[PDB]
Amino acid sequence: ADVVVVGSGVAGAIVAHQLAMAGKAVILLEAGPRMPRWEIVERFRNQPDKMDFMAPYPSSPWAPHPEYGPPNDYLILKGEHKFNSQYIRAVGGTTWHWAASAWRFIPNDFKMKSVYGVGRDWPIQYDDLEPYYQRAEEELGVWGPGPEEDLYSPRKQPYPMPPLPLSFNEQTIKTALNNYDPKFHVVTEPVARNSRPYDGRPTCCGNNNCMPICPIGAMYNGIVHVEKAERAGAKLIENAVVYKLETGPDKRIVAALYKDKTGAEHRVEGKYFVLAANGIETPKILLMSANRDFPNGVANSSDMVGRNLMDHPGTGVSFYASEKLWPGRGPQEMTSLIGFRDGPFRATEAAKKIHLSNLSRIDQETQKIFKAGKLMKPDELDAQIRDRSARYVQFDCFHEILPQPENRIVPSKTATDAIGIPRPEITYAIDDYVKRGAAHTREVYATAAKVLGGTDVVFNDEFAPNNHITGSTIMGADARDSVVDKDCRTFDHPNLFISSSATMPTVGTVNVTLTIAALALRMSDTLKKEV
Amino acid sequence: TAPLDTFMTLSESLTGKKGLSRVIGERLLQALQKGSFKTADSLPQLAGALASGSLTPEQESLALTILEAWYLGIVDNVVITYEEALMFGVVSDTLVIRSYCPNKPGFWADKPIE
Ligand SMILES: *Cc1cc2c(cc1C)nc1c(=O)[nH]c(=O)nc-1n2C[C@H](O)[C@H](O)[C@H](O)COP(=O)(O)OP(=O)(O)OC[C@H]1O[C@@H](n2cnc3c(N)ncnc32)[C@H](O)[C@@H]1O
Ligand SMILES: O=C1O[C@H](CO)[C@@H](O)[C@H](O)[C@H]1O
Numbered sequence: 308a309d310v311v312v313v314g315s316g317v318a319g320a321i322v323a324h325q326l327a328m329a330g331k332a333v334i335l336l337e338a339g340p341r342m343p344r345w346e347i348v349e350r351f352r353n354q355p356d357k358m359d360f361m362a363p364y365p366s367s368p369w370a371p372h373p374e375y376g377p378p379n380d381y382l383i384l385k386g387e388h389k390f391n392s393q394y395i396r397a398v399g400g401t402t403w404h405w406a407a408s409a410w411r412f413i414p415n416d417f418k419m420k421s422v423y424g425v426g427r428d429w430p431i432q433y434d435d436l437e438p439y440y441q442r443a444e445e446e447l448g449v450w451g452p453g454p455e456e457d458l459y460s461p462r463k464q465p466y467p468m469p470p471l472p473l474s475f476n477e478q479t480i481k482t483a484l485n486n487y488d489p490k491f492h493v494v495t496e497p498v499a500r501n502s503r504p505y506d507g508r509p510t511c512c513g514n515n516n517c518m519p520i521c522p523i524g525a526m527y528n529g530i531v532h533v534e535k536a537e538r539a540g541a542k543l544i545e546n547a548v549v550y551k552l553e554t555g556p557d558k559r560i561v562a563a564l565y566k567d568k569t570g571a572e573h574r575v576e577g578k579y580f581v582l583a584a585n586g587i588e589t590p591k592i593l594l595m596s597a598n599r600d601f602p603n604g605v606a607n608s609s610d611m612v613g614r615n616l617m618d619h620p621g622t623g624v625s626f627y628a629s630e631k632l633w634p635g636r637g638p639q640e641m642t643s644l645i646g647f648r649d650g651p652f653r654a655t656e657a658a659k660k661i662h663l664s665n666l667s668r669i670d671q672e673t674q675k676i677f678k679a680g681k682l683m684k685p686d687e688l689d690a691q692i693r694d695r696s697a698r699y700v701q702f703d704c705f706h707e708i709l710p711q712p713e714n715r716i717v718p719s720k721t722a723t724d725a726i727g728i729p730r731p732e733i734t735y736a737i738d739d740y741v742k743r744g745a746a747h748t749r750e751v752y753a754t755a756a757k758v759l760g761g762t763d764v765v766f767n768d769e770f771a772p773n774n775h776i777t778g779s780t781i782m783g784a785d786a787r788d789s790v791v792d793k794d795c796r797t798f799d800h801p802n803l804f805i806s807s808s809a810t811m812p813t814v815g816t817v818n819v820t821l822t823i824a825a826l827a828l829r830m831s832d833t834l835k836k837e838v
Numbered sequence: 839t840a841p842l843d844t845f846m847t848l849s850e851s852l853t854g855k856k857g858l859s860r861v862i863g864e865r866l867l868q869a870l871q872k873g874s875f876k877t878a879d880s881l882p883q884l885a886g887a888l889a890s891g892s893l894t895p896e897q898e899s900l901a902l903t904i905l906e907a908w909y910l911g912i913v914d915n916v917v918i919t920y921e922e923a924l925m926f927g928v929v930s931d932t933l934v935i936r937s938y939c940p941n942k943p944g945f946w947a948d949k950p951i952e
């Protein structure tokens with residue numbers, strides 16, 4: 308048919324929906340299987356570690372994905388730091404398990420290099436995206452605050468929904484933190500989650516389970532736009548793991564080759580080709596599609612496919628407050644501290660967004676008590692459970708990392724999954740850029756502790772993954788240090804587009820999936836023009 | 839008094855809760871009998887010592903193993919029960935079990951009382 312889309316994630320399904328609604332014929336190819344939510348929920352209830360957010364999504368042998376309890380070793384992580392990030396390989400993809408935080412980038416984020424000298428600018432500026440952000444916000448179903456809180460991204464319409472009330476936890480802390488220093492600027496977090504019945508989905512009931520699933524789909528999952536794109540007339544073939552894009556005599560793509568769960572090779576021809584396979588499996592189809600007129604791997608005449616790969620290095624603190632706060636009432640995250648999202652310093656350091664957890668801590672605090680190996684009367688035990696799971700506060704952040712071409716993903720010459728497809732070999736390091744911010748990030752934590760009567764203060768100074776797989780096919784000016792034009796079309800192949808965070812020259816200071824949806828809608832507009 | 843009878847009365851002492859499921863009690867016993875209660879003497883003995891008197895660090899270690907199984911609902915990294923785990927019951931007034939709604943609007947803006 309007319310358009311072939313690889314990846315039933317959010318990025319792929321938004322495109323597939325837009326173009327299938329315009330009556331044009333579409334084929335959506337998914338590596339992994341179609342699994343419903345009642346199944347994920349059941350696998351969730353039955354799993355022993357309820358902090359493992361990858362654990363209720365089976366790593367299919369034909370379309371594996373990273374697991375870490377225990378490690379399934381699917382990724383080869385060489386370098387100086389583990390790129391141990393998570394992603395799902397099933398219909399609807401990784402927005403099955405996200406916290407549904409739906410931020411826009413700020414104006415500097417697009418002109419990092421010009422403004423700060425570091426990093427590397429985008430072709431497009433904030434204001435080309437803004438109208439596209441707004442439709443993203445409507446399409447996902449984003450709640451966020453009105454004009455009483457500046458988020459620093461210039462709005463034209465207001466947020467489709469208002470926030471629900473903060474938890475006593477998140478509100479008390481927002482008040483105390485902003486009262487110690489209003490520079491911190493704790494705000495209500497914009498989120499793809501319902502404060503009222505919306506686009507057919509129900510209102511949020513406070514399941515506290517946002518990652519790794521909603522039982523009710525009160526928050527947005529990519530599966531929403533799959534079931535949409537399907538009703539528009541797109542053809543869903545799941546268990547179709549694409550390993551090759553074939554080039555033709557005009558420097559254009561002409562088919563995508565894909566294997567089934569058997570490893571039996573199949574072919575699908577189309578007029579246009581969108582690649583939405585997360586910021587790893589996407590380069591991994593590019594470098595693996597090398598051939599006659601395209602030696603160095605499809606769309607990669609810049610040497611840039613798989614390079615300048617980024618995520619937000621994470622750093623945290625934990626403590627028991629002096630005041631009972633009761634995390635785990637309402638959504639898992641409702642509140643973020645954005646005081647450092649921007650400023651002068653971003654030429655020396657990484658910016659961050661810090662965020663308070665509102666996650667239920669009964670399991671963690673009950674386990675902790677039993678490790679003290681002291682038998683107590685049922686009444687002390689129950690008292691101490693309620694006290695500890697009432698006062699626990701935890702903070703976490705996203706530092707920015709800049710697009711370095713050393714940091715990269717390549718298919719393995721050696722390593723192979725159960726059906727012949729080479730495997731991700733990510734190399735990755737964290738420079739003093741990120742580390743010099745994180746030293747300051749950790750002074751904020753030390754202060755926050757002291758404000759809230761902090762006891763048992765532990766700093767978590769190991770950089771944690773944050774699942775923002777961004778940069779791997781950087782968009783830019785011209786094809787001699789870039790893979791894609793400002794329109795997220797590949798400089799080499801005129802009928803190939805990349806719907807993914809792979810297209811993003813900067814990771815910035817916030818969850819990037821909104822921005823992914825911005826570009827996915829923006830692209831869908833462009834391609835609709837083409838016959 | 840089979841192993842279950844003794845297990846279930848031990849559990850009523852150690853947890854203090856009256857009306858613990860025997861359908862779940864049997865499942866926790868069987869799971870624990872993979873790694874604990876290898877003797878047929880260990881359980882009646884623990885019931886005795888736990889009654890009047892004191893415990894050896896190894897008897898108190900077993901008591902804890904039993905409490906731990908009712909509270910967390912997991913033995914040897916296997917969920918025996920999720921919904922009927924006792925720790926959830928201790929804070930039921932304020933906190934939900936993740937993936938089960940309260941039948942109310944939730945209303946989380948209030949400060950919990952006691
Ligand atoms: C794990 C995680 C991630 C996450 C998050 C919390 C957790 C625990 N919280 C987030 C948040 O609050 N806000 C946010 O913006 N992002 C958050 N994330 C990350 C987020 O899920 C991802 O950025 C997002 O999912 C990316 O969307 P995209 O649609 O680009 O990619 P995907 O969701 O990873 O789906 C990719 C699909 O492609 C298919 N695929 C991959 N390779 C192939 C091949 N070769 N052939 C066919 N299909 C392929 C995958 O199967 C998948 O469906
Ligand atoms: O966006 C995210 O949501 C969470 C927000 O803090 C965080 O835990 C995840 O690592 C990240 O993927």
Ligand code: F3S
Pocket residue numbers: 500510511512513514515516517518520521522523524525526637638639
């Ligand atoms: S999982 Fe569901 S109902 Fe609300 S708090 Fe999270 S969205």
